[PDB]
Amino acid sequence: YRRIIVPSKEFCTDSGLVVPSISYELHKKLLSVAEKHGLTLERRLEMTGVCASQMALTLLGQRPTVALLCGPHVKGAQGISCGRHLANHDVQVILFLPNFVKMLESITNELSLFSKTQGQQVSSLKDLPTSPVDLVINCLDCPENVFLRDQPWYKAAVAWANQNRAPVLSIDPPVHIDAKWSLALGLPLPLGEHAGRIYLCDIGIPQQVFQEVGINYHSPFGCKFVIPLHS
Amino acid sequence: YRRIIVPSKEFCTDSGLVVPSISYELHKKLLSVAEKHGLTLERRLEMTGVCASQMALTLLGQRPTVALLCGPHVKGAQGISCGRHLANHDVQVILFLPNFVKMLESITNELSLFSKTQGQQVSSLKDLPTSPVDLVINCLDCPENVFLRDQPWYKAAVAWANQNRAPVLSIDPPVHIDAKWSLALGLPLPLGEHAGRIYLCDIGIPQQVFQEVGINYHSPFGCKFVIPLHS
Numbered sequence: 001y002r003r004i005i006v007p008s009k010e011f012c013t014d015s016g017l018v019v020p021s022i023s024y025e026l027h028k029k030l031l032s033v034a035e036k037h038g039l040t041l042e043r044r045l046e047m048t049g050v051c052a053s054q055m056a057l058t059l060l061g062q063r064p065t066v067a068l069l070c071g072p073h074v075k076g077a078q079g080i081s082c083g084r085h086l087a088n089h090d091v092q093v094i095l096f097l098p099n100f101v102k103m104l105e106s107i108t109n110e111l112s113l114f115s116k117t118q119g120q121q122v123s124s125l126k127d128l129p130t131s132p133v134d135l136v137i138n139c140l141d142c143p144e145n146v147f148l149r150d151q152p153w154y155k156a157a158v159a160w161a162n163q164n165r166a167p168v169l170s171i172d173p174p175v176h177i178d179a180k181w182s183l184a185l186g187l188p189l190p191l192g193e194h195a196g197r198i199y200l201c202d203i204g205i206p207q208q209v210f211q212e213v214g215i216n217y218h219s220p221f222g223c224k225f226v227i228p229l230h231s
Numbered sequence: 232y233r234r235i236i237v238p239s240k241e242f243c244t245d246s247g248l249v250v251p252s253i254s255y256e257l258h259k260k261l262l263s264v265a266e267k268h269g270l271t272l273e274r275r276l277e278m279t280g281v282c283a284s285q286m287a288l289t290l291l292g293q294r295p296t297v298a299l300l301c302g303p304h305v306k307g308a309q310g311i312s313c314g315r316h317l318a319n320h321d322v323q324v325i326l327f328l329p330n331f332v333k334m335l336e337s338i339t340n341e342l343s344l345f346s347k348t349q350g351q352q353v354s355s356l357k358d359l360p361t362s363p364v365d366l367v368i369n370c371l372d373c374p375e376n377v378f379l380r381d382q383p384w385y386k387a388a389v390a391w392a393n394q395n396r397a398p399v400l401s402i403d404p405p406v407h408i409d410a411k412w413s414l415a416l417g418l419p420l421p422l423g424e425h426a427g428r429i430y431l432c433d434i435g436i437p438q439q440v441f442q443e444v445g446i447n448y449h450s451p452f453g454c455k456f457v458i459p460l461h462s
Contacts, residue, residue: 037344042271043273046274050281085435087437089453090449109269112268113269115437118438206346206347207348208346209347219320219321221319221320222320
């Protein structure tokens with residue numbers, strides 16, 4: 001039944017527990033409270049990295065190949081963290097990331113860690129394998145970067161993901177490339193049918209943090225860190 | 232065969248890959264290099280937390296009960312992080328931690344995060360369940376705290392773990408309480424038969440960090456973050 005209560009969409013787990021959707025703002029505010037209460041950005045990034053990589057690995061089954069399409073924003077950095085963890089586990093990670101002017105700390109740190117792996121970083125779409133890869137991970141869009149959707153590298157990246165034939169995993173995709181699987185973090189946004197097979201990841205938000213932002217929360221995860229969700 | 236080469240004991244995986252042991256100093260120096268190369272303490276603590284909790288959960292199978300025996304050192308903090316993650320997943324976590332004078336940052340932060348969960352923190356052994364719990368997790372000992380072994384709370388804690396009947400998981404135990412399972416981190420120390428069923432956890436050390444401390448490394452994990460090891 002309904003264990004989580006929010007003050008829009010409604011998903012359920014394999015056990016039929018109802019996990020509701022939350023607005024983008026409520027999601028950001030929840031993340032802002034956690035960070036004040038200890039769970040830093042680089043702590044979330046590390047965990048998201050691990051858990052996302054663990055899901056990606058399950059989806060994977062010579063070494064498999066994963067294409068990583070990240071943007072110059074905090075959603076992109078999540079993908080990098082994920083990419084790094086996969087590269088650790090003998091997966092051929094090739095990460096696409098466009099160059100930028102004003103440096104982004106989250107990206108800075110995650111790239112630096114990525115450097116030390118055998119994963120490959122590219123700033124071109126033409127440096128990616130012509131032959132379909134095993135999995136494409138998409139972290140191209142941050143909802144606060146409204147105008148970045150019109151970019152030539154953006155439309156060209158979108159074009160690449162769609163021509164490769166490889167199935168797409170979208171980590172923390174926007175509400176509004178067809179993803180085969182989409183991964184939500186902590187709590188889902190009201191994700192549409194465009195999102196495909198929807199999963200929810202645990203980012204280690206303590207139960208009392210939810211109650212502070214007015215959410216009666218009871219963990220829908222059981223004993224898994226990534227769970228499938230249904231409509 | 233032998234993929235990892237070190238410049239003592241030798242374990243092998245289910246696939247028969249040989250993973251060798253490393254000295255405590257080499258282990259600390261490896262951790263010291265990673266931290267310089269980006270992977271901070273709180274990043275390792277977060278990941279160790281997740282992966283250790285994931286193992287503990289596998290060992291677990293009304294809500295199950297886990298007793299958490301942590302010391303006032305960085306090994307203790309690992310246990311707290313683990314405890315916090317379990318408490319997130321509807322496990323009854325009761326954490327034993329003795330009071331101390333000079334405050335320990337790692338513990339400070341992890342306790343603060345633990346606070347926000349429904350997990351219970353105690354400084355007494357008499358506050359723990361009289362009826363055997365489902366699992367006891369032991370992080371009582373840091374090898375640099377030589378003299379802390381003689382402590383009255385130490386000998387009394389050791390006494391508690393042994394009288395409960397519950398199986399013991401020792402996360403990052405010393406080389407020299409009988410653990411049913413012991414978990415090593417990144418690379419194992421030459422752990423003796425006293426350690427019991429030995430597993431190796433991934434703490435997200437990039438391949439190039441190993442080569443800097445003179446270790447030709449190839450990931451023994453395959454696609455798991457915790458693996459069993461054999462002699």
